[PDB]
Amino acid sequence: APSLSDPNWQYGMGGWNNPRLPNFNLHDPTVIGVDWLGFLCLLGASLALMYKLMSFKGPDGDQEFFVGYREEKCLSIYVNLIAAITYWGRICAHFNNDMGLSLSVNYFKYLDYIFTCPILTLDLLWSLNLPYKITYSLFVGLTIACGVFCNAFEPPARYLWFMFGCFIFAFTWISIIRLVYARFQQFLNKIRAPLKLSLTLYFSIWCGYPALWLLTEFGAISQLAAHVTTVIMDVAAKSVYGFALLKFQLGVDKRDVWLDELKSV
Amino acid sequence: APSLSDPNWQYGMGGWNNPRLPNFNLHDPTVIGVDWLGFLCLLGASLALMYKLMSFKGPDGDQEFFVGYREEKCLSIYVNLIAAITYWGRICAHFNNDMGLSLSVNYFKYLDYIFTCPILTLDLLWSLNLPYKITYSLFVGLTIACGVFCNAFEPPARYLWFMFGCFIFAFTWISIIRLVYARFQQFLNKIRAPLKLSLTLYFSIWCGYPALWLLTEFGAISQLAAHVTTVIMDVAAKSVYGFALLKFQLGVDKRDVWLDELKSV
Amino acid sequence: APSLSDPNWQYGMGGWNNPRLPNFNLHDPTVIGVDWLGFLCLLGASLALMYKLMSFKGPDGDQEFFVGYREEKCLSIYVNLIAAITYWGRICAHFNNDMGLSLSVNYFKYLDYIFTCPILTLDLLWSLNLPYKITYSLFVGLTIACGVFCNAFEPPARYLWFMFGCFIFAFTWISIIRLVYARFQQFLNKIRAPLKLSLTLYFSIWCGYPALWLLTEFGAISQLAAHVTTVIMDVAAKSVYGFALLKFQLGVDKRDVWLDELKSV
Numbered sequence: 001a002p003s004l005s006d007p008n009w010q011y012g013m014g015g016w017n018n019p020r021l022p023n024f025n026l027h028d029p030t031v032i033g034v035d036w037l038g039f040l041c042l043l044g045a046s047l048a049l050m051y052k053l054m055s056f057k058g059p060d061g062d063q064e065f066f067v068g069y070r071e072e073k074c075l076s077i078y079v080n081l082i083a084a085i086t087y088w089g090r091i092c093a094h095f096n097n098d099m100g101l102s103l104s105v106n107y108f109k110y111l112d113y114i115f116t117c118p119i120l121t122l123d124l125l126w127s128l129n130l131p132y133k134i135t136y137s138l139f140v141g142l143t144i145a146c147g148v149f150c151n152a153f154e155p156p157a158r159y160l161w162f163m164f165g166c167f168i169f170a171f172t173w174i175s176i177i178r179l180v181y182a183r184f185q186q187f188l189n190k191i192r193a194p195l196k197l198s199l200t201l202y203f204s205i206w207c208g209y210p211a212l213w214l215l216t217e218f219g220a221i222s223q224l225a226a227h228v229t230t231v232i233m234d235v236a237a238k239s240v241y242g243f244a245l246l247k248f249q250l251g252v253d254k255r256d257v258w259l260d261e262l263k264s265v
Numbered sequence: 266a267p268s269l270s271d272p273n274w275q276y277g278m279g280g281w282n283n284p285r286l287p288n289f290n291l292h293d294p295t296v297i298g299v300d301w302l303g304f305l306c307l308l309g310a311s312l313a314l315m316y317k318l319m320s321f322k323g324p325d326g327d328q329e330f331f332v333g334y335r336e337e338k339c340l341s342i343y344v345n346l347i348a349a350i351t352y353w354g355r356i357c358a359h360f361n362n363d364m365g366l367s368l369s370v371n372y373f374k375y376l377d378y379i380f381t382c383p384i385l386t387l388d389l390l391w392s393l394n395l396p397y398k399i400t401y402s403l404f405v406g407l408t409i410a411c412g413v414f415c416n417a418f419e420p421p422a423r424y425l426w427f428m429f430g431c432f433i434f435a436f437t438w439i440s441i442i443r444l445v446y447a448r449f450q451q452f453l454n455k456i457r458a459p460l461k462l463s464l465t466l467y468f469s470i471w472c473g474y475p476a477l478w479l480l481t482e483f484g485a486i487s488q489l490a491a492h493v494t495t496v497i498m499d500v501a502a503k504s505v506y507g508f509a510l511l512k513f514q515l516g517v518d519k520r521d522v523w524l525d526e527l528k529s530v
Numbered sequence: 531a532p533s534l535s536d537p538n539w540q541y542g543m544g545g546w547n548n549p550r551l552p553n554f555n556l557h558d559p560t561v562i563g564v565d566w567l568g569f570l571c572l573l574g575a576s577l578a579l580m581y582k583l584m585s586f587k588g589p590d591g592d593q594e595f596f597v598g599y600r601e602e603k604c605l606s607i608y609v610n611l612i613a614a615i616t617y618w619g620r621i622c623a624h625f626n627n628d629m630g631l632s633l634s635v636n637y638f639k640y641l642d643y644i645f646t647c648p649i650l651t652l653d654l655l656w657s658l659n660l661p662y663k664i665t666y667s668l669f670v671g672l673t674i675a676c677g678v679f680c681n682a683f684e685p686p687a688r689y690l691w692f693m694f695g696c697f698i699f700a701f702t703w704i705s706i707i708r709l710v711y712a713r714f715q716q717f718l719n720k721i722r723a724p725l726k727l728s729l730t731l732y733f734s735i736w737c738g739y740p741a742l743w744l745l746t747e748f749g750a751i752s753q754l755a756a757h758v759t760t761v762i763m764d765v766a767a768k769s770v771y772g773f774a775l776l777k778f779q780l781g782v783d784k785r786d787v788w789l790d791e792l793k794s795v
């Protein structure tokens with residue numbers, strides 16, 4: 001009796017077809033332009049990061065492959081490159097008239113984030129030498145899986161999965177923010193306002209994904225606007241972050257007095 | 266000519282439909298109750314482990330994030346949490362009348378074990394400082410993949426995959442048991458009978474999965490009884506294990522004389 | 531309007547059905563024999579590597595589990611074993627008349643390579659102590675994913691994915707070859723011609739995969755010949771490599787003067 005096809009519901013792209021959202025035309029000029037812009041931004045950021053890292057000769061300017069033997073510094077590059085590949089799929093799907101198996105790369109919403117967000121969290125926590133560097137990465141991965149199930153499934157299980165992922169993300173993100181603030185309250189030793197604004201806005205960009213999902217679900221924001229905003233948030237979250245960290249963890253052993261093991265909060 | 270739909274066989278939930286097993290009603294009160302109990306047990310165990318670990322301040326009571334900078338101690342928590350998420354899916358599938366895409370979380374038998382058993386084996390071998398700590402984890406993962414293919418496929422390939430996974434598991438488990446006995450014959454220095462009973466019964470719980478599959482396949486044990494027994498075995502294998510290890514590897518560097526590199530068997 | 535089924539194209543095994551290639555009879559005696567030979571070769575190589583590694587007692591002949599506590603030496607074994615499992619699936623699919631769900635193990639071309647090539651690259655770069663040991667592993671993985679999408683999708687997106695994977699592989703492989711030549715120009719201190727021939731032919735075997743795909747795509751080489759050549763290339767690339775490295779990185783700490791961190795190219 002159990003089956004994957006409930007005959008009381010409709011299905012389409014990405015799983016359950018919400019009866020209140022109209023069909024989203026993936027072949028609109030706005031969508032093609034925005035996807036091209038996102039792919040170009042991510043690929044350019046990845047190439048520039050790779051050039052700036054591999055070309056670094058070390059603090060004393062004699063160590064070829066200085067970053068090659070210190071792999072944790074390259075963790076940013078992958079986060080961009082994988083994203084670029086995902087966006088490349090979108091471009092391919094438009095050359096195929098947004099048709100057939102080519103859509104499979106981005107068929108399920110938030111699935112592409114499974115291979116990026118955990119690595120971004122891991123690199124952010126490793127760069128600042130913070131505790132629970134992988135535990136929170138796994139928690140973010142489970143959040144992404146919860147979101148994938150939520151967007152794929154029918155209303156009841158969809159909302160239950162959303163709630164599960166929401167508490168997991170809330171706990172992990174509050175913990176990460178407290179750790180990062182504790183670490184950065186030592187750096188302060190003009191920079192204060194810009195640093196605080198950058199930190200709070202970077203946290204807000206992450207917090208804005210579930211807000212966008214909720215706005216899209218109940219017909220507040222249109223699907224086209226949601227797509228454009230999602231592309232902008234992905235670019236802002238991934239491209240800048242690596243460049244911001246590049247001028248910070250270059251030519252260091254990552255065990256300085258500033259970045260020693262966190263003590264007393 | 267090749268196709269994924271052999272017209273000489275029937276198909277249903279989880280792949281091939283055995284013509285000798287009746288359809289298993291996933292919407293039975295017993296199944297809902299047992300799945301709720303399993304989810305509650307796994308989630309409670311995960312939360313209690315997380316609280317007891319993150320709250321540990323170190324041997325001298327001055328190291329906040331003592332476990333945060335020693336990640337290998339948290340490897341237990343993930344094993345539970347992932348399991349809980351899997352069980353959460355079951356609960357979601359019952360709120361959706363055991364219908365539609367919601368079943369996809371537990372569509373394929375033993376697939377959920379792919380992300381838990383390797384981590385459990387890795388943590389068990391790392392805690393006791395034993396050799397081949399990852400090789401046996403990968404072997405267990407390949408065993409889980411073999412079981413997934415076995416349950417998914419039609420009789421001939423099903424039995425061949427079962428046989429392959431069976432020898433892999435036999436070799437890996439005998440090796441692990443010999444290593445664990447060699448390590449624990451030093452600890453003995455009242456505890457002997459309880460420790461031996463706990464160790465042998467924990468090994469028996471792992472050994473009982475293929476036995477349950479064989480009993481279910483040939484109509485000895487009913488599918489409902491198999492489901493209840495599988496839930497009990499999962500709880501026993503995962504919830505207790507972490508709590509048992511918690512009072513052992515707390516506030517240590519994991520390189521003591523007892524847990525030095527194994528020598529002479 | 532978007533759907534995974536473009537009605538202007540045909541579909542079959544592995545995704546898009548090329549209208550210029552005839553249906554490939556997977557139940558031909560040549561295919562069964564070649565798959566059996568490949569499975570036997572990979573499994574025998576894995577078993578012999580495992581026996582020769584686990585049985586090593588260390589440089590001074592007193593360290594049981596010498597390789598067990600030095601895991602990076604076993605990275606070869608997994609590369610073979612996983613491959614064997616994949617080939618096992620093929621054998622299973624022939625016992626099921628090349629029918630039904632059993633084909634799912636090898637439904638998508640190059641998907642099986644996702645879990646082998648990255649590990650092979652990682653082990654090769656780690657054994658010689660070379661930089662970017664994981665970055666190039668991830669690049670090879672993304673190349674394999676690009677190839678999977680290329681073979682799965684319809685002509686336009688297929689060729690675009692092929693081009694993307696082709697540049698990624700070109701960059702990564704030229705970088706790896708330059709690093710390996712730089713490392714091995716120190717070893718030279720009769721061996722020169724055999725070593726150079728082995729190195730260049732091993733690189734050529736890797737370079738020959740996209741060449742085989744291009745030859746198959748445009749009806750130059752027949753599908754049966756492509757299958758046999760692919761099996762031979764897999765055996766040559768995986769079985770020999772581990773045995774070649776076995777007599778090199780046995781009973782060493784992997785930080786000798788020859789294998790110190792690469793300097794000045």
Ligand SMILES: *C/C=C(C)/C=C/C=C(C)/C=C/C1=C(C)CCCC1(C)C
Pocket residue numbers: 083110113116117120143144146147148150162165166169206209210213234237238
């Ligand atoms: C580059 C892409 C990034 C950083 C994406 C991040 C995505 C999230 C943090 C998503 C979070 C979600 C929840 C907290 C609730 C469930 C829905 C999600 C997946 C959108």
Ligand SMILES: *C/C=C(C)/C=C/C=C(C)/C=C/C1=C(C)CCCC1(C)C
Pocket residue numbers: 348375378381382385408409411412413415427430431434471474475478499502503
């Ligand atoms: C928490 C869940 C756990 C520990 C599950 C463990 C499962 C196994 C050890 C399964 C083993 C199997 C075989 C040895 C043969 C093939 C069938 C399996 C997968 C049930």
Ligand SMILES: *C/C=C(C)/C=C/C=C(C)/C=C/C1=C(C)CCCC1(C)C
Pocket residue numbers: 613640643646647650673674676677678680692695696699736739740743764767768
């Ligand atoms: C044991 C199997 C091995 C080593 C397989 C290796 C495969 C490749 C290096 C494949 C490379 C490809 C490209 C560079 C272009 C796209 C097509 C591929 C995947 C065949």
